[PDB]
Design a protein around this ligand. Structure first.
Ligand SMILES: [K+]
Ligand SMILES: [K+]
Ligand SMILES: [K+]
Ligand SMILES: [K+]
Ligand SMILES: [K+]
Ligand SMILES: [K+]
Ligand SMILES: [K+]
Ligand SMILES: [K+]
Ligand SMILES: [K+]
Ligand SMILES: [K+]
Ligand SMILES: [K+]
Ligand SMILES: [K+]
Ligand SMILES: [Mg+2]
Ligand SMILES: [Mg+2]
Ligand SMILES: [Mg+2]
Ligand SMILES: [Mg+2]
Ligand SMILES: [Mg+2]
Ligand SMILES: [Mg+2]
Ligand SMILES: [Mg+2]
Ligand SMILES: [Mg+2]
Ligand SMILES: [Mg+2]
Ligand SMILES: [Mg+2]
Ligand SMILES: [Mg+2]
Ligand SMILES: [Mg+2]
Ligand SMILES: [Mg+2]
Ligand SMILES: [Mg+2]
Ligand SMILES: [Mg+2]
Ligand SMILES: [Mg+2]
Ligand SMILES: [Mg+2]
Ligand SMILES: [Mg+2]
Ligand SMILES: [Mg+2]
Ligand SMILES: [Mg+2]
Ligand SMILES: [Mg+2]
Ligand SMILES: [Mg+2]
Lengths: 183, 259, 127
RNA sequence: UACCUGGUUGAUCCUGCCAGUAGUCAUAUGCUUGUCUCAAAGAUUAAGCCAUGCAUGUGUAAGUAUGAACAAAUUCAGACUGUGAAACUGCGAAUGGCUCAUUAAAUCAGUUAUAGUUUGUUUGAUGGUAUCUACUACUCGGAUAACCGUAGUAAUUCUAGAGCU
RNA sequence: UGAUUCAUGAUAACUCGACGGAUCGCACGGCCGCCGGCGACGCAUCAUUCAAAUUUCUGCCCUAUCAACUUUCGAUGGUAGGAUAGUGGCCUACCAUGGUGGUGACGGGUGACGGAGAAUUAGGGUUCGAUUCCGGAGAGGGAGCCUGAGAAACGGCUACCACAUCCAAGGAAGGCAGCAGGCGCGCAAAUUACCCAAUCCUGACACGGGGAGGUAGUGACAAUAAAUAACAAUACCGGCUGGUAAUUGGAAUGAGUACAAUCUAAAUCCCUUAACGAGGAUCCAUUGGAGGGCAAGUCUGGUGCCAGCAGCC
RNA sequence: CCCGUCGCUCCUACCGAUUGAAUGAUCCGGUGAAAUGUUCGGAUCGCGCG
């Protein structure tokens, strides 16, 4: 027996059933370009997560209103959606979960947030800044654009303290140019 | 197999031990002793996993070989010694006395007890019969044998045993109206009072127990341990007093505590 | 550029005659703190007469940088450490010397000596 | 998470299949392959055959030291009481690892029984008459290992005598 | 106890009974030599624990081009014995003729170990399950057996069969479906490495040992995150606003490299980080396609039912 | 538009002397290693015995 064998893993996306739907392709390209995604796999992963959440909500809504399982899991799901900013306090019913779109999840990406608060001139600039270790959520440097920012952590986004845009120690290019200009 | 198995795979360890899936390929196999393998808590788990005195298997062995841990007032140096329900675990160096009791979720909990409360334990009688020379005796479910027992004591009763003298100082007859704790099944760790007993010839007997909050549950006779006469247990119960809380109320309490 | 040391899960282990805790190291300016400096800082903080009784191990630097976590042990005296600590940890502190050996060579020598009986068995394993 | 599209005709509506589309903790192969974290891996055909190495040994204050073993002491007495190799004694090697050939009410799953048996060990209790006229119980007897010294054989933890304890 | 002439007691005897301590370590004490503590190991009985053996009911794929099968020589049952740890045709003697079967016996096939489970998911279903957990079986094929609490053991023995090493030719030694590794087979699968540091097992044992197990090597089986560029000036275009440019400009950074520390049983990797590391950012993205299904050219050259393409048309 | 013999190439199975061959499992009868139990036997070893 190899103990590593007991670790489990799972897939995070599925390929489209019909590869060459023109309307689907146009919509997907529009979303990818708007949010600066690297490929269709990221969009399909977000769609997979949204489908899972919507299926859970739909399953719960089938149960009786007084069912303890429905109460427990619905509260858990609503709290989860509220923590990540998907739903507003007024949106306090499982029904509003079914009205969630891929755009709602995409708007919670660290890349989209970094672009929106004004730390980047463009969504692609936000991507390159994040992957280059210039952004931190709290006191932790984050380099994953897919990072889903919670409501509480949204206001803590700032430049990394060890980066040129957040502290001192300019980049290697600037240091090299300064050294060259010293002569 | 051609004989006794000496190993226990970690996935095959009882779930109430709460062993990590990726901690290793093996779990401590309980040794022979007063308690069954599936219904025990080896000293290695208590000292390492629970009390965290030892960070490793070797540290557990080192601690135990100093003769620092006592079970039922007797020093035990066996790491896989099966310590089970109602047993007393004492560490004189740290002035710690523990009693092994089931929590509402059915897992062994090291319940800290006072010095006076650490001098006795409860036992459940299996049967009473005549030994050699006609000497009557009874045996408990923790492997103990006592000669010349009180004639009133009978099977399924609870006896208060003084560890210092190894003598029965009191006993409780199994009857309706007694507070009991369930020691097996899905209701293990719950505490309530017996309401009625159903007896079926050539079959297990069913016991109906009512929780302090009015909740009702039933279990087999072999899963019921009497804790006192009437409604007052003879020993201090762990936190929760054997009251099983639904997941909804548990979540409500957790959310209230968060704020 | 000043390093800070904090302990979180403190426990006084009387059975093993030591103190066990988690170490949190804040080093915003420098890449890391070596175990020797951490040992000296712990000795200063806890007023340890003999720094040789302090053991620190299992260190991990956080992804962002400027912070690290680990585990530390402070024994009441050097003899308790020598009596309870693993050999490799003692070697790391210089209290013990590493002995060079090869397990395969030991196995082969044992197997060779298996075939010889008596006092000559001692040199039989050499071959 | 209740979905279809091309193909028989000059055209039509059908039956009906072929083809396509998607999936496999599904194998293999082709081309390509920068980084991080996980992770299967001589099952399928041959339970076919195997060079070489390793995979089972084991010592506490608490069974047995006179190594002609080492060390510290003893100026005089001392059976031995520091380490102890080797060897006898005891225990283990029936666990673990590997594979799926045989096997179709058989194995096996759930559920039963032993008032139909065995069970080193652990835990708790329990041990009363032996010589009776021999007449050690303030303690019985004979060996053997290591050791030592005569060896046999091409050869093996192959093996014979001899002297101790 | 649901249920036992059961637990258990008493008597008469019986057995040529492996039983009823000729053992060991610490200390060192009270009475007048006698008493005396804490342990170790060991023998026997019961209970308990760790288990096994046998066992009740129900449940398994295809096949009738398998309809009768079992019963001399056990088939079904009874009586009395033997054997067994124990029940039982398990075996023996005698007796009876029974037992199963279209509600599919019996026979055959399976590229059939069973299960927990895996794939796919309206629901119902279909297909898979060698492989890390549970149970069974085997150690080249059979058979027999000693030791032992426990084995019909194979990193135990004995014999035959098949292979097969050494030999001084007289003999002698064998068992990788253990970890590596080799041949063979094939479409088809890795190093003859390090370590007991973790998990646990085992021994007289706190200490030894452990190819169990872990570490590292090979590894595009499978899975996760995620680089290959971002921003301004200028020039073109389309409506201050956007798109393009191997034009200009400075900024950013990790792939790589490497002190150091960290990691680690010791190493290595990861994480952290001095000094380096980008303009055709040569630090150069590929695999398949462009009539329809099905997203994408009635572009240009060659070939001319050839060569070729084309899952289908 | 269409059927068949006949003629050519290739592919797949079918029948078939050879009282065909190999392997596996059962059936009838026979021989039968090794081990175990039993009978006899008594090299030899200790005090007429074991
Ligand atoms: K596998
Ligand atoms: K031995
Ligand atoms: K044994
Ligand atoms: K079963
Ligand atoms: K079955
Ligand atoms: K029997
Ligand atoms: K009979
Ligand atoms: K089977
Ligand atoms: K034995
Ligand atoms: K091998
Ligand atoms: K180990
Ligand atoms: K096409
Ligand atoms: Mg096994
Ligand atoms: Mg359907
Ligand atoms: Mg047409
Ligand atoms: Mg098979
Ligand atoms: Mg059956
Ligand atoms: Mg027993
Ligand atoms: Mg009787
Ligand atoms: Mg009989
Ligand atoms: Mg299987
Ligand atoms: Mg097979
Ligand atoms: Mg395998
Ligand atoms: Mg298995
Ligand atoms: Mg076997
Ligand atoms: Mg073979
Ligand atoms: Mg064989
Ligand atoms: Mg065998
Ligand atoms: Mg082998
Ligand atoms: Mg074996
Ligand atoms: Mg492969
Ligand atoms: Mg992959
Ligand atoms: Mg590139
Ligand atoms: Mg198209």
């Amino acid at each position: 027996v190899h103990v590593a064998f007991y670790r489990n893993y799972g897939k995070t996306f599925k390929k489209p059933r019909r590869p060459y739907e023109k309307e689907r392709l146009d919509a997907e390209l529009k979303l990818v370009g708007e949010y600066g995604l690297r490929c269709k796999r990221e969009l399909w992963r977000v769609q997979y997560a949204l489908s899972r959440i919507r299926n859970a909500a739909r399953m719960l809504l089938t149960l009786d209103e007084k069912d303890p399982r429905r109460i427990f899991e619905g509260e858990a799901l609503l709290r989860r959606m509220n923590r990540y900013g998907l739903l507003d306090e007024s949106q306090n019913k499982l029904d509003y979960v079914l009205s969630l779109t891929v755009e709602n999840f995409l708007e919670r990406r660290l890349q989209t947030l970094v672009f929106k608060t004004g730390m980047a001139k463009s969504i692609h600039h936000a991507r390159v800044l994040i992957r280059q270790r210039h952004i931190r959520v709290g006191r932790q440097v984050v380099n994953v654009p897919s990072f889903m920012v919670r409501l509480d952590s949204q206001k803590h986004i700032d430049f990394s303290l060890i980066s040129p845009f957040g502290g001192g120690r300019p980049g290697r290019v600037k240091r090299k140019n300064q050294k060259a200009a010293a002569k | 197999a051609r004989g006794l198995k000496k190993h226990l795979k970690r996935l095959n360890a009882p779930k109430h031990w709460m062993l990590d899936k990726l901690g290793g390929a093996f779990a401590p196999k309980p040794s022979s002793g007063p308690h069954k393998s599936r219904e025990c808590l080896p000293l290695i788990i208590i000292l390492r996993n629970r009390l965290k005195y030892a960070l490793t298997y070797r540290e557990v062995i080192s601690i135990l070989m100093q003769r620092q841990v006592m079970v039922d007032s007797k020093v035990r140096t066996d790491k896989t010694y099966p310590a089970g329900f109602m047993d007393v675990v004492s560490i004189p160096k740290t002035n710690e006395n523990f009693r092994l009791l089931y929590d509402t979720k059915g897992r062994f909990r090291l319940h800290s007890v006072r010095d006076e409360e650490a001098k006795f334990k409860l036992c459940k009688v299996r049967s009473v019969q005549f030994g050699q020379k006609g000497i009557p005796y009874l045996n408990t479910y923790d492997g103990r044998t006592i000669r010349y027992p009180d004639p009133l004591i009978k099977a399924n009763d609870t006896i208060k045993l003084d560890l210092e003298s190894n003598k029965i100082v009191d006993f409780i007859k199994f009857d309706v109206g007694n507070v009991v704790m369930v020691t097996g099944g899905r209701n293990r760790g719950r505490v309530g009072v017996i309401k009625n007993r159903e007896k079926h010839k050539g079959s297990f007997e069913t016991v109906h127990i009512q929780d302090a909050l009015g909740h009702e549950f039933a279990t087999r006779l072999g899963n019921v341990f009497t804790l006192g006469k009437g409604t007052k247990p003879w020993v201090s119960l762990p936190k929760g007093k054997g009251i099983k809380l639904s997941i909804i109320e548990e979540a409500r309490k957790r959310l209230a505590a968060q704020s | 550029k000043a390093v800070t040391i904090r302990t979180r899960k403190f426990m006084t282990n009387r059975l093993l005659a030591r103190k066990q805790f988690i170490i949190d190291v804040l080093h915003p300016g420098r890449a890391n703190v070596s175990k020797a400096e951490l040992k000296e800082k712990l000795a200063r903080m806890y007023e340890v007469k003999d720094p040789n009784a302090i053991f620190v191990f299992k260190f991990r630097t956080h992804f962002g940088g400027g912070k690290s976590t680990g585990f530390g042990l402070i024994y009441d005296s050097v003899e308790n450490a020598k009596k309870y600590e693993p050999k490799y940890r003692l070697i790391r502190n210089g209290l013990d010397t590493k002995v060079e050996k090869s397990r395969k060579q030991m196995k082969e020598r044992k197997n060779r000596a298996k075939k010889v009986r008596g006092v000559k068995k001692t040199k039989a394993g050499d071959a």
